[PDB]
């Protein structure tokens, strides 16, 4: 941040309302916030509608609210079109801008080979009256674009007469390249943050600023954020949606901020992952998210609904005993859930198959028990009979066989959308990347409210997405890196 001064820093986040925000957007928005906060500065939110819906502006304001960012003001590039017009005319009168009717292909490698276009020497007043043709929309006007008069022979291709105004309320619109430095300057930005993929652009940016004798804006570049096995092109994502491969932009497989928060990511983890680091691997982002959520979420129990095996404590009765226990043992201010138990339990079959005819084991948060026999009807295991011994390296989780109180849950597990890491690209999709499994979970889990994060013991981490009628829960699995 060159020549930054505490209390005199202004940054801005300038997304286009042409789609929903994704993770890379989140890096930009966050870094703008981080540099503004570092100097006790101000951060503007600019909707960049230079070359133009409102559903997107709404979605943006909600995603920013969700990331916890707050802005001093909201502006639209549109709001300065009249002024940009004025500046355009000024440049025409300084012989710094001219009207051009050379064709797009021709113009493209006239630029490539550095020959001055025909109109580069146009008189001032022809340039102005052509600009008027453009502002009215005449067939002349549409054949004409205004461009800056810089240097067709510069080693920097961005310095070779870039287009400033195009004919397309307004009949003519400024390009990004021209609108960005002017608007940044007059809005009071002091430090404009931009992806360093647009890096040849800087000399042009500053050119415009000095050529109009405007207050300089420093540029701070950063790397763009891209992930393996991920697509963030807006066209590829709408393709996913239109073929019902997903059925919403909020799908947990989508790198949108909405989708990624639904999937379990915490804003804290995303910000830390941005600070504490060719594509990136989701593994480290989800490992940070794990480290962050693990000590502040409760632990509940679940067993497979269908493969569950019945365990009997022969020496107890069918009187259900209740015991308050703590949700998370380590952080004892997280609260207490309730634990119900009696003589009949459900355990996993992957656990049932592991018990030998006289082992001692431990039902977590309850106590040790003594396995007595393994009744196996047909080939499978039908039932297990054990002994209370409440007063071992086989500690298993369990549910009390109380079906009118156990909560039924669908576990959604997701895989990457595409198969390669980065025209016949749809052959690299994973369509069967949404896995459902049904479980019973602990009665006390009815406490949870939608959006809550928790852990299923010896299963993994989950977020409660929706609650169906009849208290049926939908649980999205949070990857754990």
Ligand X SMILES: Nc1ncnc2c1ncn2[C@@H]1O[C@H](COP(=O)(O)OP(=O)(O)O)[C@@H](O)[C@H]1O
Q: Which residues are catalytic?
A: 16, 224, 234
Helices within 325-428 (DSSP H only): 349-352
Instruction: Tokens for 65, please give them.
Output: 């609210």
Q: Measured between alpha carbons, how far is 262 from 437 in angstroms, rounded to an integer? A: 19
Q: Is 196 in the site for Cl ion (CB under 5 A)?
A: no
Q: d(Cα 465, Cα 473) in Å, to the nearest integer?
A: 8
Task: Judge whether 440 and 283 are in contact, CB under 8 Å.
Answer: no
359 binds, among Cl ion, ligand X, none (CB under 5 to 8 A by kind): none
Contacts (Cβ under 8 Å, ≥6 apart) of 97: 88, 91, 127, 146, 147, 148, 149, 164
Please calculate the CA angle 397-341-386 and round it to the nearest 5 degrees. 65
Pick from 233, 291, 306, 331 the residue near Cl ion by CB under 5 A: 233
Q: Which of 315, 350, 415, 468 binds Cl ion (CB under 5 A)?
A: 415
For 480, other C-beta atoms within 10 Å of its C-beta total: 16
Give me the least distance between CB of 25 and ligand X, in Å please: 5
Sheet holding 407-414, edge to edge: 299-300, 453-456, 460-467, 473-478, 407-414, 434-441, 302-304
Residue 194 interface partner, choices Cl ion, ligand X, none, CB cut-off 5-8 Å depending on type: ligand X
Query: Does 201 help bind ligand X (rule: CB under 6 A)?
Result: no
Residue with smaller CB distance to ligand X, 239 or 340:
239
- What the block records as the tokens of 399 is 């549910």
Stretch that binds ligand X, among 25-33, 393-401, 407-415, 448-456 (CB under 6 A): 25-33
416 binds, among Cl ion, ligand X, none (CB under 5 to 8 A by kind): Cl ion
Enumerate residues 203-232 that contact Cl ion by CB under 5 A.
222-223, 231
> Annotated binding residues for Mn(2+), as ranges?
57, 391, 415, 435
- The annotated binding site is made up of 16, 25, 57, 195, 224-225, 391, 415, 435
Residue 225 sits in the site that holds ligand X (CB under 6 A): yes
State whether residue 173 is helix, strand or coil. Answer: strand
1 to 20, contacts with ligand X by CB under 6 A? 14-16
DSSP state of 479: P
Regarding 416 and contact with Cl ion (CB under 5 A), the answer is: yes
Closest CA to 79 of 127, 45, 128, 43: 45
Q: Which is nearer to ligand X, 26 or 386 (CB)?
A: 26
Q: State which of positions 252-281 bind Cl ion (CB under 5 A).
A: 277
Binding mask 422-461 for ligand X (x = CB under 6 A): ----------------------------------------
If contact means CB under 5 to 8 A according to the sort of partner, which of Cl ion, ligand X, none does residue 480 touch? Answer: none
Tell me the C-alpha distance between 192 and 217, whole Å.
Answer: 7
Give the distance, in angstroms, between the CA of residue 51 and the centroid of all CA atoms in the same chain.
Answer: 25
- What b/e readout covers 419-433, taking b as 16+ CB neighbours within 10 angstroms? eeeeeeeeeebeeee
> Quick check: 211 and 173 in contact, CB under 8 A?
no
Among 248, 307, 336, 338, binds Cl ion (CB under 5 A): 248
8 binds, among Cl ion, ligand X, none (CB under 5 to 8 A by kind): none
- Tell which one of 149, 194, 453, 477 touches ligand X (CB under 6 A): 194
In the bound complex, what is the minimum distance in angstroms from residue 26's beta carbon to ligand X? 8
Shortest distance, CB of residue 221 to Cl ion, whole angstroms?
8
Alpha-carbon distances of 148 from 94, 284, 370, rounded to whole Å: 11, 45, 86
Cα three-residue angle 361-362-367, rounded to 5 degrees:
130
Choice between 45 and 441, CB closer to ligand X: 45
Smallest separation (angstroms) from ligand X to the CB of 148: 22
Taking the CA atoms of residue 130, residue 135, residue 138 and residue 141 in that order, the dihedral angle to the nearest 10 degrees is 40
419 sits near Cl ion (criterion: CB under 5 A): no
Q: Where do the H-state alpha helices sit in 278-409?
A: 282-293, 349-352
Chosen from ligand X, Cl ion, none, partner binding at 231 (C-beta under 5 to 8 Å by type): Cl ion
Q: Which of 25, 42, 262, 290 binds ligand X (CB under 6 A)?
A: 25
In angstroms, what is the minimal distance from the CB of 183 to ligand X? 13
End-to-end CA distance of the chain: 34
Write the CA distances from 80 to 13, 58, 96, 194, integer angstroms: 17, 22, 21, 21
CA 101 from chain center: how many Å? 42
Residue 10's binding partner, choosing from Cl ion, ligand X, none, with beta-carbon cut-off 5 to 8 A by kind? none
Contact pick of 58, 215, 224, 332 for ligand X (by CB under 6 A): 224
24 makes contact with ligand X (CB under 6 A): yes
Which one of 36-44, 146-154, 221-229, 421-429 is the stretch in contact with ligand X (CB under 6 A)? 221-229
Minimum distance from residue 64 beta carbon to ligand X (Å)? 12
Q: Which residues bind ligand X (CB under 6 A)?
A: 14-16, 24-25, 27-28, 48, 194-195, 224-226
Q: Which residues of the shown chain bind Cl ion in the complex (CB under 5 A)?
A: 222-223, 231, 233, 248, 277, 415-416
């Amino acid at each position: 941040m060159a020549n930054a001064v505490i209390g005199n820093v202004v940054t801005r986040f300038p997304p286009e309302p042409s789609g929903y925000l994704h993770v890379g957007h989140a890096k930009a928005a966050f870094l703008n916030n981080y540099y503004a906060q570092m100097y006790e500065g101000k951060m503007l939110l600019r909707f960049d509608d230079t070359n133009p819906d409102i559903k997107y502006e709404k979605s943006i304001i909600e995603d920013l609210e969700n990331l916890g960012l707050k802005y001093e003001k909201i502006s639209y590039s549109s709001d300065h079109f009249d002024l940009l017009e004025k500046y355009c005319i000024d440049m025409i009168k300084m012989n710094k801008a001219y009207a051009d009717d050379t064709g797009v292909e021709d113009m493209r490698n006239q630029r490539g080979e550095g020959i001055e276009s025909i109109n580069r020497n146009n008189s001032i007043e022809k340039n102005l009256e052509l600009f008027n043709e453009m502002r009215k929309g005449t067939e002349i006007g549409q054949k004409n674009c205004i461009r800056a008069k810089i240097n067709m022979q510069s080693k920097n291709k961005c310095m070779r007469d870039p287009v400033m105004y195009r004919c397309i309320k307004y009949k003519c619109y400024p390009t990004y390249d021209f609108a960005c430095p002017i608007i940044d300057s007059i809005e009071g930005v002091t430090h404009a943050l931009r992806t360093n993929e647009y890096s040849d652009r800087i000399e042009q940016y500053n050119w415009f600023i000095s050529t109009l004798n405007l207050r300089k804006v420093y540029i701070y570049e950063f790397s763009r954020l891209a992930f393996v096995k991920t697509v963030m092109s807006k066209r590829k994502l709408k393709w996913f949606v239109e073929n019902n491969v997903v059925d919403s932009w909020v799908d947990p497989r989508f790198p949108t901020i909405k989708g990624i928060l639904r999937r379990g990511l915490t804003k804290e983890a995303l910000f830390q992952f941005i600070l504490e680091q060719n594509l990136m691997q989701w593994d480290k982002l989800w490992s940070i998210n794990k480290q962050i959520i693990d000590p502040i979420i409760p632990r509940y129990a679940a067993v497979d609904k269908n493969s569950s095996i019945l365990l009997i404590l022969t020496d107890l009765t069918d009187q259900v005993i209740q015991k308050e226990r703590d949700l998370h043992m380590k952080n004892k201010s997280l609260g207490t859930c309730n634990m119900y138990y009696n003589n009949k339990y459900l355990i996993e079959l992957e656990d049932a198959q592991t018990l030998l005819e006289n082992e001692e084991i431990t039902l977590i948060k309850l106590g040790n028990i003594i396995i007595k026999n393994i009744e196996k009807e047909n080939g499978k295991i039908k039932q297990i009979n054990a002994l209370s011994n409440f007063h071992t390296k086989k500690k298993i989780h369990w549910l009390p066989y109380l079906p009118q109180q156990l909560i039924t849950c669908t576990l959604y597990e997701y895989d990457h959308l595409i198969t390669v890491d980065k025209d016949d690209w749809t052959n690299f999709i994973n369509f069967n990347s949404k896995h459902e499994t049904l479980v019973y979970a602990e009665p006390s889990i009815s406490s949870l409210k939608v959006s809550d994060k928790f852990q299923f013991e010896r299963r993994g981490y989950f977020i409660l997405d929706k609650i169906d009628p009849h208290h049926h829960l939908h649980l999205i699995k949070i990857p754990d890196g």
